[PDB]
Design a protein around this ligand. Structure first.
Ligand SMILES: O=P(O)(O)OC[C@@H](O)[C@@H](O)[C@H](O)CO
Ligand SMILES: O=P(O)(O)OC[C@@H](O)[C@@H](O)[C@H](O)CO
Lengths: 255, 263, 255, 263
């Protein structure tokens, strides 16, 4: 079924995770046609500044995510940054996320695949759509069976990302495709006003799921404060994309 | 508001070609009554890459051919101008005067079109940022234009490639009605060396994106047999597929419409 | 010999043209190895704003340029915007300049070629280096014998131009190549600090000439105030590029 | 200041290959005494496009091979790390620890390299703007790095193509010494499908541009027979051409030097 990956960018506390998980659970019960996956990072390992918020560590993060899966029965996904993190994260993560800058790091991909979990690779801002075929091949070689590729924009001049929707049908040739609605509008080194319009475009074109970072109060977020979707707006957007998908799906081109 | 569909063969290869396409557009206009159709065709391809490529049969012949389409089918007409002096004669038949993408900053051309009293549709230059179309609209208003359109047709992305930044739709909507050029946006400028290339397989997906985001109309160059077209053979939509595409975008527009943001 | 095309962006008055022409003449006498061509536009036909300075008209402009050639014996170059302007401009213009946005307008190119004058086409920000071969062919078909292609940057994201120096050797295959040092640093819709560094790069790579818009007081210029080179700095830059060219020329690759 | 020339085969194909290249670099270091040479080679290509491409013979073998080069020729050494744990063992032989372009924002990797006390050279990510390297240098200084380099190696320009924006040289010079990667800047990422492409014909012209603009050193991957290289076969410079290139850039640097702007 259609996938909706959502949650706060970073694990600011398992308190926040529980408050967001509660809403994700409610939507999960309301939209039985959709498969929800809770997401949050235990570490922002690639912040621009050395003085920015990274997180509370792997152990604290896995614990918090563990509480979300136990308390709400929701699937989990988080990203890893170095090979050794794949094993401990796989304990709770149903889907292991590979950061965009690291989409070409062979050992990280292999380490994720070895865990037997599903793998979701964020497409690097430097990669062409067709370049992702090799990424999928590495994962298959590593034993991965459930593979996703996430569109999150491509480098367009400096401090700007553009979404080339031609990427969706191209990547669908070798993997399930996810559209990152919040990451695609960020200005590297973003505009929330474009999150909804572009996600509508994503489902009109055709994808297997959407990815959205959401926070009760984005402006207070410790990471991605300018792009995280306010929690209260999630339901409306999901209902909207489901309706558009229902009508547009008749026209999705065959593989 | 009535959705606009601008369509027709890229170039006026012959008056016969125009009437054939015009007949189909007229038929669709009778079926899709909620759509405002405007027949398009260029009397001159003044910016071909190669000196050896087809340009046209002249302004005189073209206008005459376009007038025949309007007379026979009662369809609104649009064609593009390339130099200031062409605005007057063209305004005699054209309901909408089109400004080529490379010429979107040529003040005199914009002014020439604006003083005719006809509607003006400016193709957004591949070098222009969305927010910089505000001054383009200002020039037209200054020149007397009362009905203005801005057409998204892609932006230079590396060499011989164009990308469509859909954020341009809501940005440009701030100052003019917005049209999405479904066939021009998938062309590969100079992709074939002496001619430009294109990827027809992406025409439909991107037009679905356009209506989901929200626009005031779509622009599509269509030809009975694109493979044999004298210009844009790689991007013109087979005429037989026009009906299906229009039905689809009207369906997607309807379902997405309640979510279009207010400007 | 090496070409240096320089002058104020727009003809704000024949007074300005004479003051700049006087300096250009002095340098012309100092650098006999270089061929100087005086440049200025009689009309800025593509300003972003309808309220910006365009000029004093074709007639007034040609007259002013005519005075420069008569009073200083300098060659002249100015740009045309519509086909009908080629004939009257050719009366004084030794080199007819084709604006970047208009580099694909067949009739403008043909009209320029018909005059029998040399033609210098500014490479559109949307053109790939190899795409210029067809531009040259149009001019040759139109009777042009002296053809130049000028590098002035390529669209790089929004409101930014990047100079891909690979363009110089590529375009040299079919035409003489000129580097526009002032236009290449402008930010469409620039930084003067990069004019000199990039022009040094241009001659190190290898070109047939440089193009620079210069004004006694750029900040007071009616057009391109942010990129025009202060007149007093022209001599130093020319001497500098001549020295670099002298040494680097030993390494310029054969056609 | 002494000009830096970082050169060597892309990957450590064998200890034999390293000694062959090392011998030539040593010879050039004896001729060009005004240049500081640093021998480069990767013990692992951890980011190949294809799972079937050559990666290397492991960290242990690589370090041993690099130490042999340093021992036999007395040359400074540089190699890249891919994960934090590699900084310590690599610092035992490497005078300069190299940070891969895709990893230029990985905080822990930068920190790992900085605490070794060795010099650190960061390849500028193809996604990074020049002004955003300021924070990269800040992270390294925070981590204890006292000798920092930033290497220009091109920026994403459309698909499978890189462009060198030379404005980056004077911008980055504001916070670190700047190196120009002459061979990486002409590669066509994923250009050959399973492998990346490249245009060797542009290596020399662009390196001439780099020294005319002004930089603190150049980086060049070189191999006796590039055509047979196991990695970057399309961009590595034939070893026989290294001497000529170095002589040329030293000549251009000298004549342009009086014009380098003060930061
Ligand atoms: O085929 P060439 O001559 O390159 O012309 C490209 C066409 O696609 C042309 O009509 C284009 O969209 C012009 O603006
Ligand atoms: O040939 P592939 O595997 O694409 O790798 C590209 C090389 O050019 C590679 O070593 C590159 O510069 C990696 O960063």
């Amino acid at each position: 079924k259609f996938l909706v990956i959502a949650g706060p960018c970073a694990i600011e506390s398992e308190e926040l995770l529980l408050k967001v998980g509660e809403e994700i659970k409610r939507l999960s019960e309301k939209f039985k046609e959709v498969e929800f996956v809770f997401k949050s990072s235990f570490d922002k390992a690639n912040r621009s500044s050395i003085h920015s918020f990274r997180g509370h560590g792997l152990e604290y993060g896995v614990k918090a995510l563990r509480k979300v899966k136990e308390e709400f029965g929701l699937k989990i996904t988080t990203d890893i940054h170095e090979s050794w993190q794949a094993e401990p994260v796989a304990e709770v993560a149903d889907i292991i996320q590979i950061p965009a800058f690291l989409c070409r790091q062979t050992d990280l991909l292999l380490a994720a695949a070895k865990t037997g979990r599903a793998v979701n690779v964020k497409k690097g801002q430097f990669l062409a759509p067709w370049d992702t075929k090799n990424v999928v091949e590495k994962l298959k070689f590593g034993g991965a069976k459930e593979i996703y590729l996430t569109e999150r924009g491509t480098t367009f001049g400096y401090n700007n990302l553009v979404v080339d929707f031609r990427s969706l049908p191209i990547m669908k040739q070798w993997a399930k495709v996810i559209y990152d609605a919040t990451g695609s509008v960020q200005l590297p080194g973003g505009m929330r006003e474009f999150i909804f319009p572009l996600i509508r475009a994503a489902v009109a074109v055709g994808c297997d799921g959407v990815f959205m970072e959401t926070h009760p109060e984005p402006e207070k977020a410790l990471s991605d404060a300018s792009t995280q979707l306010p929690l209260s707006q999630l339901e409306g957007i999901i209902e909207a994309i489901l309706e558009i998908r229902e009508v547009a799906s008749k026209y999705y081109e065959t593989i």
